[model samples]
Target: GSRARVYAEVNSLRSREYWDYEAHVPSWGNQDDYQLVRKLGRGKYSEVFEAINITNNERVVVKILKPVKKKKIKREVKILENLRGGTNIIKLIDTVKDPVSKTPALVFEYINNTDFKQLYQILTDFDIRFYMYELLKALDYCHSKGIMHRDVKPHNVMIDHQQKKLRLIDWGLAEFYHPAQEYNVRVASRYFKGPELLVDYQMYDYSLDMWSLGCMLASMIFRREPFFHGQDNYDQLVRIAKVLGTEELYGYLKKYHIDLDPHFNDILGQHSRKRWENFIHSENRHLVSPEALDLLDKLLRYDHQQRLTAKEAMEHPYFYPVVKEQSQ
Candidate 1:
């Protein structure tokens, strides 16, 4: 019942080759060109490593994929290629597969990133604005290209504070949008999942990313690791309801003709909407401001259609200072 207000038909306008990943034939690179330096981290789908590109003697990230469908691998590579040169999008250097085991890996430009858990604590108020604005550029670019980054979280965002660089990584879950398409709700991280996902609304679009961004922004400004610390998917809706109120939540469900899952019957108790001002306190007073709250308010709306598009979010007054700084 809902559709994005902007860039809604980008996929329709582009050639099939632009959005079709299943048909993409990946050109495999020589895996021997790189040597793993150490483990970077592991995810459900891939093991990341810090490596040196022996050919160039430069640092790189080699993400060795775990067993997954070949189609899924093609999707990630195709999305990366489509979004190549996009602002703050992680650069894909090469795609290689181990000859014998047939294990696949993606080589990427190395980013000297300090974990956001540590780096966010040290960022100044201005630094948050600068980096968040930089993040929007990536979101807008991807959305404009008709791709939805189903997962948008601090862990997926690589920030190299020393270089003032940020890259939106992990295109593994990214997908091209088609109008009225029923996408998998099991995409984003629990804490960052949008109301649509929680409510099992399948027709969500790029506005889903806006909600996740709002979650990240809320955590940053309020000094909470996750603004919505939902215990489970059902509790996730309850956590949001506590803040945005159950009244507005029902209205959203009604408008979309979505039936609430029976699971919420016992757990989702009545809650009045809490004001953003209630979250402002001494510790976070410096980070919370009128413009900041206004932007957050727009992005956190339960109605996906009402949420700000990535381009509109970038134009918000909250980023005025960031825009001014960039212009200088």
Candidate 2:
């Protein structure tokens, strides 16, 4: 029920017209300022490239957005601008559109990021906590400023391990918070999506990111590329229930009066929650500590409100060394 809504982290900012995204029109700059260096990667919404500024000779990332609604383009640009100076949030350098194709593009500061696939194998237990703590700074800052990063995954988090720097990137799916608003449940990636998204609950908020963070942290500690490997969006909840237990999932659904879609009736079956220790092995056992498991337990809750907020997660005992050392 609406009466049981989670933290109103950005309640004051929700009413401000600064989040009137649909009405705001972006003034795109010239694409001639940048020279494409190489193709870095591609996404569902855009193609990414390594580029350099012709006038300044500085390296940057050029994200050429695919044909999408003008409103979506504006929303991404606006949100990045709003959160630009915030800790660990990606910085947007410029916005431009092609003259002939008229395709919109966003330029950003480049980070020499080590791929998580390789980096995780080399990371000490302390590295995981330190970087995860840095990630919370970005998440908490955005929540405080009225934005929720719908997509939070290993791919979206850029890390320069040598410098111990982390930046949360990709604001294409991000949205501003409005009290009692019904947001699109199809926002996040399949594996990292929260229970609210899979259960068709649209009134989710910033705590959704904490669920994704939990998934990423789980993979790092368990040595599973994806902790919950669902074949499709429909089976995603089944995978979640298998580990979290159907009893707790149904409890969350009943509290919110959510009637499971008839299609899912057959797939929903009883299963007990798996113990976190069951995932420990000789290879990744070094990362498994009581504090780590405690933090993961708080994050992967079936109820969004039951999950820790980004600020609360940062204060967890798992990050105690980071807090004490940084403070001193």
Candidate 3:
């Protein structure tokens, strides 16, 4: 057991009502207040739609959740309420449920976001630095309030580049962090899953988001859609090992006394740690700088305990321009 270097006992210190989702009762709204304009997308857990609130004539995102345990629904609503108004956090406008069918939907503020795949392709060096810094602010705010955003993929990050606004959305998988607690490893998306999750080391903390953020930053800087292109769950670790090196992975496992799954005995191969500089090329050269590489290296550590805290990451030299602009 490693504990987070920062905000380790946040949940323990807070009132039980703040983190006790099971006991919280949700006040439901009428679904008829919003009309679906178009389907945005669907996930395993929910179907999203672009809608307008008839009451106020405001555009909103209506996330109709699939039939799941009420506990899970309560947890999501509780976390959203806890994190409401935090920097870059998605605003939950209202909670609605179909009275007859009992189906639930969450209403949220609409964001004019350009998909990351297309947006990353066109972002300048400053844009990358700016958005990443904004993301760190969200992560830091959540962590300080005792929550770990289990899902930190690009898809969960909504960016309106025209307005230079970003919102970290989809709190369904997010959970409150308690020191030394074992969490479910099956949380994040395959590409952004951290080493702690892949290794079945459940005693992870806020540092997990830093790893996912590192993956997003790497893809943007190196011109790769997913910096770690793993085919399956098991191969996910292998993909990371190939680049981060098997030796360091061993060291990380040894430190935590985590037994590498037998499944990896045959598939895990020897690999030397690849230098970050090797990723630079004419297409991505503008985004690759000493400060950028330095920050990336710190965030993508094999050891979860070694990864930079979100607050520390924001203060890194790479974000100096972002920090300066914020002050002005």
Error of 3 at 315 (Å): 0.5
- Candidate 1 lDDT over 233-293, as tens digits, reads 9998999999999999999999999989998999989999999999988989999899999
lDDT of 2 by residue, 137-180 (tens): 99889888778899999999999999888999999999987767
TM-scores for candidates 1 onward, in order: 0.98, 0.95, 0.98
Off by over 4 Å in 1: 1-6
Predict model 1's lDDT versus the native: 0.91
Off by over 4 Å in 2: 1-15
Candidate 1 or 3, higher lDDT? 3
After TM-score superposition, what is the CA distance of residue 270 in candidate 1 from its true location, in Å?
Answer: 0.7
Please report, as a residue range, the 10-residue window in candidate 3 with the lowest summed lDDT. 1-10
In angstroms, how far off is 263's CA in candidate 2? 2.5
The alpha-carbon lDDT assigned to residue 136 of candidate 3 equals: 92
